[PDB]
């Protein structure tokens, strides 16, 4: 984690393009985040192009912690994301929540998938 | 002109500075997704962009006067931007039409272009204005006036008909549906009212979306919505200043406490068959794990109040809040080791425990229990950790539960899921579809769910299923209470898609009246789940005002609710 002229690098970007969309991710970006830091998601394909503040930190076990927070145009009492986000395991997952459409994020090592929420589940009724 | 492409701009999309009359060009061979205009740009730089690839592309319009986050680029498709330093954005440059006739009606004649303007002026202005129905799908269209006689738009062809008149600054954006055949707005320009204009009382509403704002020296004690607008009209009422107000619950379908705070910001939308202004946002007050909570909760000042108890913040008891209006809401949540009693005027007498999550609702006759809490045993593969990782594994099925809480509070449906244990654990099937029979009978996972008291059982596993990433028995008995997915194909918001099965909920589409509800505006979570609902006559659509569901035909929270407390029974004290 310690490092030189490199830890001051605070972009507001937290992952770039590259069934689902694939996406590059950099766990040490949110870890040097605070609450009240800046933090921007693209989506472009799937129209979500905004940005948004850390409001809080928690962490929920010794190995994963939760980042929240809420976007600042908006509707204030009900749109904001999570990022909860595994050590050991490079194990990061987003749940975006907009008033366009809710998408969620699942990485590992770097490398992840965004999709919407229908993609999710496929599955037939099942009988006796 | 200067022409430039992907390729001749390191196969990037940042389109360059430094142009005075600037061309990018997309082709089958030339082509990149996301496309970007500079920031630094003098004043009357030109930027054009055009496209001829089967792929589309996707435009930033941070830095343009669009209000649009993303401009979607088809083949055909020709943009044109103008700087400006003034402003310090690119101003469109857009297909304008206009009516010509000066008569009360004209329909407006528009092209193939995905992005269209009808500007409607002085000399160029007809009473009622009219869309084209059966355009190419995707066809956005701004109508924008600057006359100073008004006019309005057609409904006919339109998702709800809203007050869409047209007076000097009103702005529209539509987008046309083919699954609808209907224009459906997009962007709706606000009208600013300050509070001190009108009073206590707006007698109508103008415009599809009015914006009352309060601050100080701009200010009332009480205020009183319209008793009647157009279908779908939305009032949005903000507050900056230092004391508190009153918005009257008249004409407005809530007995709840809508006390105007200052930052609060409530939303109200009509709804024409039933003749009341739904609310469709209010504040909450949050007292977070980090935050102190009273021994006694607060009076009610807003529709709802979630308390959420840490070890940090523990309380042995709490007392539900002594002043309340019928339909306030109290949502506990737990994360302390210990129990914390809670306790009411009317003599209710509870407990919440550790991870349990728990909603109130207040009554004419004092506060009411408004949520089940079902117990879930959560079963992960061996499999599954091993390309996971063995925290990553328990990570995921946990999202999945927020996920369920979060689509059954924003539902009212009366039920929370509460992770009572986590074992790994591989129920012993060569297919997903085998793995939920069996682990009905499952000694292992059995004898934990007895042993933990879990109403539930839920299985997160590797095998492949037959025709499909997850499982779980409708309308299932204790014996049949389990469902599963995989990693493969279903991500974690599949569980909240299961367990509805579980309650006895059907696709879309279904005979039975807990069925799912699908929209190409937005589907619940049985019949399609791209938003955070479960079906019912008494939702809609936050953005598009869609009611998700019908009376009698389509109500998953109706079936939910009579399923919830039954279910939540199942392993008991
Ligand atoms: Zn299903």
Known sequence: SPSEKERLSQQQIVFNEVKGMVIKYDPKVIELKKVGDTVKFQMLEYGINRTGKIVEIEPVDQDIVRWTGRFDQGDPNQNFFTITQSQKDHYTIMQIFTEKGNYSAEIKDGVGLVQTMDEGVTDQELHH | ?573
């Open chain 2, 1 to 573: 002109a200067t022409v430039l492409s992907p390729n001749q701009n390191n196969n990037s999309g940042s389109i360059p500075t430094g142009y005075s009359d600037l061309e990018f060009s997309l082709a089958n061979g030339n082509w990149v997704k996301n496309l970007s205009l500079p920031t630094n740009a003098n004043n009357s730089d030109k930027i054009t962009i055009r496209s001829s690839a089967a792929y589309s592309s996707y435009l930033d319009t941070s830095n343009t006067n669009i209000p649009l986050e993303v401009l979607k680029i088809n083949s055909g498709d020709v943009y044109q931007f103008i700087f400006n330093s003034s402003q310090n954005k690119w101003i469109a440059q857009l297909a304008t039409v206009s009516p010509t006739t000066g008569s009360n009606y004209e329909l407006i004649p528009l092209t193939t272009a995905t992005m269209q303007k009808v500007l409607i002026q002085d000399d160029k202005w007809a009473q009622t204005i009219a869309l084209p129905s059966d355009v190419r799908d995707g066809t956005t269209v701004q109508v924008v006036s600057t006359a100073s006689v008004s006019s309005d738009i057609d409904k006919t062809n339109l998702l709800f008909p809203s007050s869409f008149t047209l007076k000097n600054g009103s702005e529209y954006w539509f987008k046309y549906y083919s699954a609808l055949g209907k224009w459906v707005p997009e962007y709706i320009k606000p009208q600013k009212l300050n509070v001190q204009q009108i009073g206590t009382s707006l007698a109508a509403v103008n415009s599809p979306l009015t914006e009352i704002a309060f601050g100080d020296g701009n200010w009332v004690s009480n205020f009183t919505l319209p008793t009647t607008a157009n279908d779908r009209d939305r009032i949005i009422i903000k507050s900056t200043a230092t004391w508190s107000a009153k918005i009257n619950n008249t004409n407005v379908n809530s007995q709840a406490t809508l006390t105007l705070k200052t930052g609060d910001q409530y939303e109200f939308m009509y709804v024409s068959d039933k003749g009341y202004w739904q609310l469709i946002s209010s504040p909450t007050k949050v007292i977070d794990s980090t935050a102190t909570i009273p021994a006694i909760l607060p009076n009610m000042t807003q529709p709802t109040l979630k308390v959420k108890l840490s070890t940090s913040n523990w309380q042995p008891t709490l007392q539900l809040p002594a002043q309340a209006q019928v339909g306030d809401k109290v949502v506990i949540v737990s994360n302390a080791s210990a129990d914390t009693y809670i306790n009411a005027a009317n003599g209710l007498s509870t407990a919440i425990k550790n991870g349990e999550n728990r909603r109130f609702i207040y009554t004419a006759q004092g506060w009411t229990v408004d949520s089940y809490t079902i117990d879930m045993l959560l079963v992960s593969s061996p499999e599954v950790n091993s390309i996971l990782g063995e925290s990553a594994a328990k990570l995921r099925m946990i999202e999945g539960v927020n996920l369920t809480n979060l689509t059954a509070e924003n539902s009212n449906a009366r039920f929370y899921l509460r992770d009572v244990g986590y074992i790994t654990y591989k129920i012993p099937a060569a297919t997903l579809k085998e793995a939920i029979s069996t682990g009905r009978d499952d000694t292992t996972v059995q004898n934990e769910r007895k042993r933990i008291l879990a109403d539930g059982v839920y299985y997160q596993g590797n095998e492949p299923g037959d025709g499909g990433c997850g499982w779980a028995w409708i309308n299932a008995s204790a014996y049949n209470m389990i469902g599963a997915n995989d990693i493969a194909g279903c991500s974690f918001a599949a569980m909240r898609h299961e367990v509805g099965h579980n309650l006895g909920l059907y696709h879309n589409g279904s005979t039975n009246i807990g069925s799912g509800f699908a929209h190409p505006l937005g589907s619940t979570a049985m019949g399609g789940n791209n938003i955070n609902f479960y079906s019912s006559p008494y939702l809609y659509n936050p953005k598009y005002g869609v009611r998700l569901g019908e009376e009698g035909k389509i109500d998953a929270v109706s079936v939910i609710n009579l399923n919830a407390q039954k279910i939540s029974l199942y392993n008991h004290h």
